[PDB]
């Protein structure tokens, strides 16, 4: 199952602080994974900010999570060798109604 | 620029409808890519739904975008790792 992959992966927003469902960014660092640092969103409140600027708790902050692909050094002893893996990650929070 | 990769991968909700910044999923299919189908999201309204369920043109639906890694079949004359920006959903913001 070991294929060769060519690497072409070579190459702001305050929404986190201005959202009705604002969040803080937590560092997911695994020195054995590419990408090494994935900034995940942690919803600041269980509810959402109202016009008055207070947390209305009859609405809910929830996190939008996407399954993403990552490379992990494997076998760990061997460099230039990796395995493909799927990880779930929070990208941001939105505001929803319950029921 | 090449690396060896084991391609054995190692491992719903209606938020899109219940959000003050709701959104629809547009199919992006590329038979040469893994993932073959990526369901991108488009903010339905330019503004957000208020308490009563009407739209406020002062609050704004914006898309949450993230760079994701994808594999593309290397032409006959195996695969290449690339990064694409995608929209996963919309949130509501104020200027």
């Amino acid at each position, epitope marked *: *199952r070991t*294929v060769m992959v060519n690497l072409n992966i070579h190459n702001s927003s305050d929404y986190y602080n201005r959202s009705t469902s604002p969040w803080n960014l937590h560092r997911n660092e695994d020195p054995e994974r590419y990408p090494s640092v994935i900034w995940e969103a942690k919803c600041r409140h269980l509810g959402c900010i109202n016009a008055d600027g207070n947390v209305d708790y009859h609405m809910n902050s929830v996190p939008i999570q996407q399954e993403i692909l990552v490379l992990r050094r494997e076998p760990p002893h061997c460099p230039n060798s990796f395995r493909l893996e799927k990880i779930l990650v929070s990208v941001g929070c939105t505001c929803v109604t319950p029921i | 620029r090449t690396v060896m990769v084991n*391609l*054995n*991968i190692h491992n719903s909700s209606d938020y899109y409808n219940r959000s003050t910044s709701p959104w629809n999923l547009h199919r992006n299919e*590329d*038979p*040469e*890519r*893994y*993932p*073959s189908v990526i369901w991108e999201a488009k903010c339905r309204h330019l503004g957000c739904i208020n308490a009563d369920g009407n739209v406020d043109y002062h609050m704004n639906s914006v898309p949450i975008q993230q760079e994701i890694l994808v594999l593309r*079949r290397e032409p*006959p004359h195996s695969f290449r790792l690339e990064k694409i920006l995608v929209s996963v959903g919309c949130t509501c913001v104020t200027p």
Partner: antibody
Amino acid sequence: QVQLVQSGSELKKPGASVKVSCKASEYIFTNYGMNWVKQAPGQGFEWMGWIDTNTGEPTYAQGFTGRFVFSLDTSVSTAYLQISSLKAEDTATYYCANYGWGYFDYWGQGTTVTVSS
Amino acid sequence: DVVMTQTPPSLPVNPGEPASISCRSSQSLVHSNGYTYLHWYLQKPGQSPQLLIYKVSNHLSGVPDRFSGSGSGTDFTLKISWVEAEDVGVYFCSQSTHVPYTFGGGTKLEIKR
């Protein structure tokens, strides 16, 4: 050099159900999973749909929404076609075919399902 | 459904002489990604079907050049040049640009005598 080895010939009475197997010699990395094709006697190939060998999610062609279930057991690298309320039209040879990167690459030998009173 | 009109239904060929099979699409097989998902498959007598050409002209590692794919949009053609005895079987096209995937009726290659 992967080989898809399908199950075996089946005889069934009208109203019954059949589950056909398609086991792979080895793992197949694909952006799209296994596809299923019906060939009635003396007729052409008709696409039934497919199942993602990654998610397990099936997708059924307009012909085959009701009495048709695609399923998968990765442990033994095998896929399964199930047909219920077997009718006469269902008498046919059914083939499993891997699809990846925009085309079918490997096909099973086909399984013949005969519906008879 | 995209209809695949494949012809001829039967093709008797003197061994060493060529064979030409044609596939017509009821609409363009040009995908939005720019590629054309028109493929040619052969089922040799008493055997599982096998791939010969994919994406109009692309060959599998084993297929010899004597097998050639050509075409664009709604018109496509497979050519077998030095028809041997191993070639006897049913040749058929698939388009998978469009859902549902569809298939030509088939052409049966038999040796002429």
